[PDB]
Amino acid sequence: LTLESLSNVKANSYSEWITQPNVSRTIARELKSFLLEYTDETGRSVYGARIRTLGEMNSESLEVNYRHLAESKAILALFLAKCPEEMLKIFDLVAMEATELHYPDYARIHSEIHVRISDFPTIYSLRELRESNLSSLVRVTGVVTRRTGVFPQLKYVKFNCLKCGSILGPFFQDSNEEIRISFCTNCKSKGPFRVNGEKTVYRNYQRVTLQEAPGTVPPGRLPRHREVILLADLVDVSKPGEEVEVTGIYKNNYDGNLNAKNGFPVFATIIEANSIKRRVFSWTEEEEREFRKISRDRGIIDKIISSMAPSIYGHRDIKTAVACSLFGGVPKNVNGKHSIRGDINVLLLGDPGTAKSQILKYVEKTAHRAVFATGQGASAVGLTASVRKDPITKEWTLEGGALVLADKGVCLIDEFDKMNDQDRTSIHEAMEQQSISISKAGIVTTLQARCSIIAAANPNGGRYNSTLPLAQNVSLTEPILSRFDILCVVRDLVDEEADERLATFVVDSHVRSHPSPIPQELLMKYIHYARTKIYPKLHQMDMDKVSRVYADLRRESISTGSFPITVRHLESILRIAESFAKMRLSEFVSSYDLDRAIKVVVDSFVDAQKVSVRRQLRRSFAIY
Amino acid sequence: KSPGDNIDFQTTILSRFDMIFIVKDDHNEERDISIANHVINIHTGNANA
Numbered sequence A: 001l002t003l004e005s006l007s008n009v010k011a012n013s014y015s016e017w018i019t020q021p022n023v024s025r026t027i028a029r030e031l032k033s034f035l036l037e038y039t040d041e042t043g044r045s046v047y048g049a050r051i052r053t054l055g056e057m058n059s060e061s062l063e064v065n066y067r068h069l070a071e072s073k074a075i076l077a078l079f080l081a082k083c084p085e086e087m088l089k090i091f092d093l094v095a096m097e098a099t100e101l102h103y104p105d106y107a108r109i110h111s112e113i114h115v116r117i118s119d120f121p122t123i124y125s126l127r128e129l130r131e132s133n134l135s136s137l138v139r140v141t142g143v144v145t146r147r148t149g150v151f152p153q154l155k156y157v158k159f160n161c162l163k164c165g166s167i168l169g170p171f172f173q174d175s176n177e178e179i180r181i182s183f184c185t186n187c188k189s190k191g192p193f194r195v196n197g198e199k200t201v202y203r204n205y206q207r208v209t210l211q212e213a214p215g216t217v218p219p220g221r222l223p224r225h226r227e228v229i230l231l232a233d234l235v236d237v238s239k240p241g242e243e244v245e246v247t248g249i250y251k252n253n254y255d256g257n258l259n260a261k262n263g264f265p266v267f268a269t270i271i272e273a274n275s276i277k278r279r280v281f282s283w284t285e286e287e288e289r290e291f292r293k294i295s296r297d298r299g300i301i302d303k304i305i306s307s308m309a310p311s312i313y314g315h316r317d318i319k320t321a322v323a324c325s326l327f328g329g330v331p332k333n334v335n336g337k338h339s340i341r342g343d344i345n346v347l348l349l350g351d352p353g354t355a356k357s358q359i360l361k362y363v364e365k366t367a368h369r370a371v372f373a374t375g376q377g378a379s380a381v382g383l384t385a386s387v388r389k390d391p392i393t394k395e396w397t398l399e400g401g402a403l404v405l406a407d408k409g410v411c412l413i414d415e416f417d418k419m420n421d422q423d424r425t426s427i428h429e430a431m432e433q434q435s436i437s438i439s440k441a442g443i444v445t446t447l448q449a450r451c452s453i454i455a456a457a458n459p460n461g462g463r464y465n466s467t468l469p470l471a472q473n474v475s476l477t478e479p480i481l482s483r484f485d486i487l488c489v490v491r492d493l494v495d496e497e498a499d500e501r502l503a504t505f506v507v508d509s510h511v512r513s514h515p516s517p518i519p520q521e522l523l524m525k526y527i528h529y530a531r532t533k534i535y536p537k538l539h540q541m542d543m544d545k546v547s548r549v550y551a552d553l554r555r556e557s558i559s560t561g562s563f564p565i566t567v568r569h570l571e572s573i574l575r576i577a578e579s580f581a582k583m584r585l586s587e588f589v590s591s592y593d594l595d596r597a598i599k600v601v602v603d604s605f606v607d608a609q610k611v612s613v614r615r616q617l618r619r620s621f622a623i624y
Numbered sequence B: 001k002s003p004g005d006n007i008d009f010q011t012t013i014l015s016r017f018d019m020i021f022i023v024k025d026d027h028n029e030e031r032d033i034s035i036a037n038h039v040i041n042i043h044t045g046n047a048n049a
């Protein structure tokens, strides 16, 4: 037949038209012509180059564009819309033959090529679907709410004859109903027959639940949902919580026995998938020499310190601390008998309305391994380890808190002052020993909790009391406070000039939202490379200065009658110097980095003190 | 102040132990120099060799 001949159907329906041998041969030949005769604007072989990159990675799936097939040959597009199931087998055999025609012996490295249609005009919401859409090609949006594991499905099945012990050859599984045999060719029997698990070849299977995105739902109504089945290379692509675009076929579950089941005869529906798309920190040798180049510009430190929370006004000290705790340091083991941690903890104590949660939000978008938990609220993760039951699989699971789940990363605790006793015990253990212990339901174990803590809290009453020390404004205890390196105090001092700029910035935000800076994308990757390969050094020519600095700050602290100074302050000094040095991708901690570090600790100590002590110290420590 | 009221618990708990070690952080420049030097060498790498 010819192409304009096919567009006069001479059968009861499309399905019976497509299955006739003469029309199948025609469409197979015309698909070969489409594969090997396309040309872009310039004329490049759009599918030729795709079929040669098929060879290199050796993939088993091919991408086709509906726009091109509508451009060339329209009856094929109509049949693809109406009866895709029959079309896709024919189209997949054509692709496999064409690939072999350009890569010989690829039928061994892979035995079947899958076609996935990329673009398609009509896009539906889950609530619009009706019974006129059954057995048709559809494209939908939604959000992924649940996910199952990977189960194997039968592809090439071998049977045993339990009288003459023979293995009957490959039989194909259609993904509709289970296949059963009835005749043994060697002994001529219809006896018992069982599937040979060892000689069978299987396929990947997974199921997902799609929900209407909350934003689009018209007022007053509720979101609808549907189920999606993914086969082979599509398993484990979209993790729960993301928005996806699905191209597939709309089908009925042939439930079971329609007998019994008294009541109206209703049926259930599913979607069988063809393509999924979404609607990183790995780097390359192109960007490595750009890293090194930016590292040679004097003053990379102040660029980084102004590339942090790029939408909160002022608060330079907290941004410096954020950078320090977002780069890190070097963990240490002295001959397997002494450990000094590497991460630097940061506490925020501030009055209501100073944008602490905004910085905590930024840290989570900027970091690799960051987790969020709340003290007094509703969060998807707690702080205590436990053994609970899985609602879906009905299994017992071991779950750790955010502290365990955020190993070698950062943990973000919001509303740090409203914890119950259990959460406080967990936090203390994690910060002190850096490992979580559990003895529940026969499980005795210790887990690793090498994590960085950033926390936010509100004083007692609601406002800061400058006439008393830090320990008497907040409900936390000295054991916990002493385990933090840097303490930041945000004070709502009524100053006339500052309000001008604060209100200006805030009003500009609303006005603009009506219906130095390094780019964030490069900073994200620079942070990972630096923390992966940069372990700066401490050559001891520079020991004389710090000995005498510590001596002076110890002699002054006891004289003034305030907090004691212990060696944890010097350890913090060195650990922060490591971070300032690592900022410059450096090779030997400089004295400039040490001097920059000294300010942070001295300022923290001076600013966390009573008014009288603070006036004494702010004059005594003027040189550092 | 007596050691008894220097602890936030009952004083009969002390009779349970065998050795009671009270460590006092006394300020003195010469000790400070030595301890600071000790810490700074451990962070250098000297104590590892």
Ligand SMILES: Nc1ncnc2c1ncn2[C@@H]1O[C@H](COP(=O)(O)OP(=O)(O)OP(=O)(O)O)[C@@H](O)[C@H]1O
Pocket: A311, A312, A313, A314, A350, A351, A352, A353, A354, A355, A356, A357, A358, A458, A506
């Ligand atoms: N310095 C600031 N610069 C910019 N925006 C600010 C600043 N301080 C507060 N805001 C804004 O004011 C609001 C404060 O809300 P937010 O929850 O962040 O404050 P908070 O101190 O974390 O809250 P609370 O302590 O009362 O729980 C936000 O819109 C925040 O962006």
Ligand SMILES: [Mg+2]
Pocket: A356, A357
């Ligand atoms: Mg808040």
Ligand SMILES: [Zn+2]
Pocket: A161, A162, A163, A164, A165, A166, A184, A185, A186, A187, A188, A189
């Ligand atoms: Zn037989």
